[PDB]
Structures are given as structure tokens and as C-alpha cells.
Amino acid sequence: QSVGDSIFPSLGQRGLDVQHYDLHLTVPRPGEPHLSGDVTLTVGAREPLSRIVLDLLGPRVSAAQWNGQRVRWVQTAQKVEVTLPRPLRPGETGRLRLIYAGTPELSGDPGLPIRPGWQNEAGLSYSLSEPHGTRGFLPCNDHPSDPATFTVRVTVPASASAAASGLFTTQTERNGLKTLTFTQRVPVPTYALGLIVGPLERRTAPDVQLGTQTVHRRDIYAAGLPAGTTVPEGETARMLRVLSDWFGPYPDEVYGVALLPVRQLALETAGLTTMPATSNRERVRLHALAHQWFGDQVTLADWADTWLSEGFATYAELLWAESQGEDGQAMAADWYARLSVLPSRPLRATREEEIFDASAYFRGALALHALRLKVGDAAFGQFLHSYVKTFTGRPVSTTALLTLVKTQLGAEAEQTLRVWVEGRTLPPLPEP
Numbered sequence: 001q002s003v004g005d006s007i008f009p010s011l012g013q014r015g016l017d018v019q020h021y022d023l024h025l026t027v028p029r030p031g032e033p034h035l036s037g038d039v040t041l042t043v044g045a046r047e048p049l050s051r052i053v054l055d056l057l058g059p060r061v062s063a064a065q066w067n068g069q070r071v072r073w074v075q076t077a078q079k080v081e082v083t084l085p086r087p088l089r090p091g092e093t094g095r096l097r098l099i100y101a102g103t104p105e106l107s108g109d110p111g112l113p114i115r116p117g118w119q120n121e122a123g124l125s126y127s128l129s130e131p132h133g134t135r136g137f138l139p140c141n142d143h144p145s146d147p148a149t150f151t152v153r154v155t156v157p158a159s160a161s162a163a164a165s166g167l168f169t170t171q172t173e174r175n176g177l178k179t180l181t182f183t184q185r186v187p188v189p190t191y192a193l194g195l196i197v198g199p200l201e202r203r204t205a206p207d208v209q210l211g212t213q214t215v216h217r218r219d220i221y222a223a224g225l226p227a228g229t230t231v232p233e234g235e236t237a238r239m240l241r242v243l244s245d246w247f248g249p250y251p252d253e254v255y256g257v258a259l260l261p262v263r264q265l266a267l268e269t270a271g272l273t274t275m276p277a278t279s280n281r282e283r284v285r286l287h288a289l290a291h292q293w294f295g296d297q298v299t300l301a302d303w304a305d306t307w308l309s310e311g312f313a314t315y316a317e318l319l320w321a322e323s324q325g326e327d328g329q330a331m332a333a334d335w336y337a338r339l340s341v342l343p344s345r346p347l348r349a350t351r352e353e354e355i356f357d358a359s360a361y362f363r364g365a366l367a368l369h370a371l372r373l374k375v376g377d378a379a380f381g382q383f384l385h386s387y388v389k390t391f392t393g394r395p396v397s398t399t400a401l402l403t404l405v406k407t408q409l410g411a412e413a414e415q416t417l418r419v420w421v422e423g424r425t426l427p428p429l430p431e432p
């Protein structure tokens with residue numbers, strides 16, 4: 001019934017394909033966890049579904065409709081189960097509307113320093129929900145194998161403002177409440193939905209032209225940022241140019257960061273990375289932008305494969321550094337030095353504690369480094385382009401990566417990657 005994730009075996013619904021979330025979120029007091037929601041999901045199915053089973057953790061559903069009609073539904077501790085009048089069958093779509101309100105719950109953190117979900121701090125409420133926190137404030141198929149598009153209408157006090165992933169279109173004001181509308185038009189995982197409410201400023205920059213593609217530029221600055229918390233002019237443009245030349249077209253219509261005066265890790269929310277000021281460094285800004293491809297466009301089939309996101313986004317930092325004239329092998333050697341004094345593992349994680357560990361970042365990055373040195377920069381660059389296209393609209397797995405390497409780069413290239421993917425001991429440092 002669930003997706004059957006190796007790490008989180010209860011999340012999601014098997015065969016469920018949510019294509020679009022139309023969310024109206026109302027935050028009465030930014031900084032306080034209470035909220036209310038009105039969401040319509042446009043859902044498809046990959047296998048016949050007699051029910052729609054969504055993840056929800058905290059708020060209480062008060063009403064549900066299926067294609068405009070009253071429908072039978074029950075809410076458990078962590079699920080909303082909607083009995084459909086008839087099975088939803090592949091090729092068909094329906095619209096599930098849920099009315100809900102209450103207090104989002106944070107998913108317990110046994111792996112990361114973040115308890116993921118709806119965060120409340122310093123007059124700010126915002127999503128920091130990787131891996132399974134989005135269900136706290138949004139009834140969702142909470143699994144990266146099912147990305148979707150989002151249209152979000154956020155209602156906040158007039159004194160406040162809001163920013164969500166996607167292009168900002170309208171703001172209206174009535175009875176002391178503002179409503180802002182954002183349109184995420186390319187599909188991303190549930191946790192990649194950025195959503196921040198409170199005292200925030202929108203700042204635009206000139207468009208970035210990437211040969212037959214225009215990328216809009218805007219950052220968000222919340223109040224109370226430390227002195228010197230900035231995105232310096234033109235850096236995002238040069239990063240977009242270097243990364244897209246390596247990976248292919250930037251998958252979204254806008255990019256920027258939302259700089260927050262809190263102390264947490266950066267999260268790669270789509271087209272608008274949620275960036276605590278503590279993490280606002282050049283390498284982290286590159287890292288988060290690389291995730292727009294690897295993580296947000298290319299999504300995981302299973303949470304055990306986080307290195308396909310974290311390792312790829314980490315290696316992009318080395319590709320960027322070399323683009324700025326730096327010595328990439330030295331950076332690779334530094335990564336290796338840091339891993340050499342830590343326990344190592346195969347890249348496919350077996351436990352939740354591992355999915356964001358040092359192996360996922362740096363052993364994954366060095367896995368790509370081994371492959372690149374084996375096949376050369378030209379072949380490696382064409383593989384990255386082929387990889388992104390192969391796994392757009394189809395979730396990626398470690399096995400599928402190795403199969404792709406075998407057909408595209410050959411059996412020797414595949415076994416080079418396999419030494420780094422499999423095997424408990426950390427292999428020697430990859431060298432030219």
C-alpha cells in the first residue's frame with residue numbers, strides 16, 4: 001500500500017501519482033505553528049487505486065471532496081484515507097480537495113540535526129522538511145519518487161509577507177490579510193517546496209541568459225540577518241552558467257536564495273533555496289543550486305540513494321572550483337583526507353542515520369571523481385548531460401546509474417564506479 005521505501009517503509013502510497021498541488025495556506029501569526037489549509041490535489045494512478053492515501057502529521061482534516069462531490073474519508077495518526085466512489089485507473093485523473101487546520105508536527109530527527117517539517121523561529125514560519133516533514137503542513141504523497149507541480153496561495157497578516165517556490169504573480173489585501181500567489185511550474189519533490197512567511201524582503205536581479213533559456217533572478221532577505229549576509233552581484237549568474245554547461249539546461253524559471261536569520265542547514269527548495277545565514281557560503285550556494293538538477297529535477301526512487309543527490313551536489317562544488325581556476329584534485333584529496341579517518345559504507349544506505357552522513361556527500365562525490373578520471377572530462381560531461389535527461393520524469397536509483405554507466409561509458413567505467421558504490425572499505429584516492 002505504501003511506497004515501500006527501504007528507509008521509511010510507511011511513507012507514500014504505491015501507484016499514486018500526484019501531478020499538481022493547489023494549496024491555499026493561511027498562517028495567522030508567522031512564528032507560531034498554527035495554520036489552516038485548503039488544498040486540491042490533481043492525482044493520477046500507475047495502478048488501479050480504490051483509495052487515496054496521503055501523509056498528514058498534525059493538522060486535522062475537516063472536509064474532503066472528490067471531483068467536487070462528498071466522499072468518504074478517515075484520518076489516522078499519520079494518514080488520510082479517502083475511499084473513492086470507483087477505482088482511479090491509469091490514464092484517469094481526479095481532484096481531491098481537503099480542508100484542514102491545526103498544528104504541524106515535526107518528524108523526529110535520528111539522522112540530521114534538523115527536525116524536519118514546519119519550522120517556527122523568530123517571527124518566521126517556513127518549510128525545512130527533507131525528508132518527510134512536508135506531511136506536517138500539507139496532505140501529500142510524501143516521497144521523492146512522486147514529484148509534482150505546486151500553486152500556492154499564502155495568506156498572512158498585512159504586516160507580514162511570504163515567499164514560496166515558483167514565480168510570484170499576485171498579492172491582494174483585504175481585512176488586514178495579504179494573499180500572495182506562487183506557481184511552481186516544473187515538478188519537484190514535496191520537501192523541495194519552499195514556503196516561508198514572516199518579515200521578508202523580495203530583491204530581484206537581472207535575468208540570466210543561458211543560450212536559448214532565460215532564468216529569472218530574485219532572492220529573499222528576512223529581517224535580522226547578520227551583517228555581511230549577502231548574495232554578491234553576478235555570482236548566481238556565473239554559477240548557473242558553469243553548472244548548466246556541465247548538466248544541461250537549468251530545470252526551472254527562476255533561482256535565488258531565501259536568507260534566514262536562523263542557524264540551520266541550507267535546503268535546496270525549488271528555484272528558491274532556503275538559506276540560513278549560518279550556511280551562507282559560496283560553496284553551499286553552489287551546492288544548493290546543483291541540487292536543482294540532482295535532487296529536485298532528478299529525484300530519488302528510494303531514500304537509501306541520497307548520495308545520488310548529495311554526492312552529485314557535492315561534486316558540483318569541485319566542478320565549480322575548477323571553473324574558477326582552482327585545483328580540483330587538491331579538493332578531492334581534502335575530501336579523501338576527511339573520509340579516511342571516518343567509518344565508511346557502501347553508497348546504498350541501510351539505515352536512516354546514514355542517509356545524510358559523510359559517505360553520502362564525499363564518498364559519493366569521490367565516486368564521481370573516480371569515474372571522471374577513468375573516462376576523461378569530455379566523456380564525463382556528456383554522461384552528466386545524458387544522466388540528467390535519462391532521469392528527468394523517472395526516479396533514479398543506484399542500480400540504474402550503474403546500468404546507465406555500463407551502456408554509455410562501457411564495462412570498465414562501470415566497474416570503476418562499482419568499486420566506489422559497493423564495498424565496505426574506502427578505496428584509495430582516485431588520482432589522474
Ligand SMILES: N[C@@H](Cc1c[nH]c2ccccc12)C(=O)O
Nearest residue numbers: 114116128129130131265266267
Ligand atoms: N539536502 C540538504 C541536507 C538536509 C537533509 N534534510 C534536511 C532538512 C533541512 C535542511 C537540510 C537538510 C543538503 O543539501 O545538505
Ligand SMILES: [Zn+2]
Nearest residue numbers: 287291310313
Ligand atoms: Zn546537499
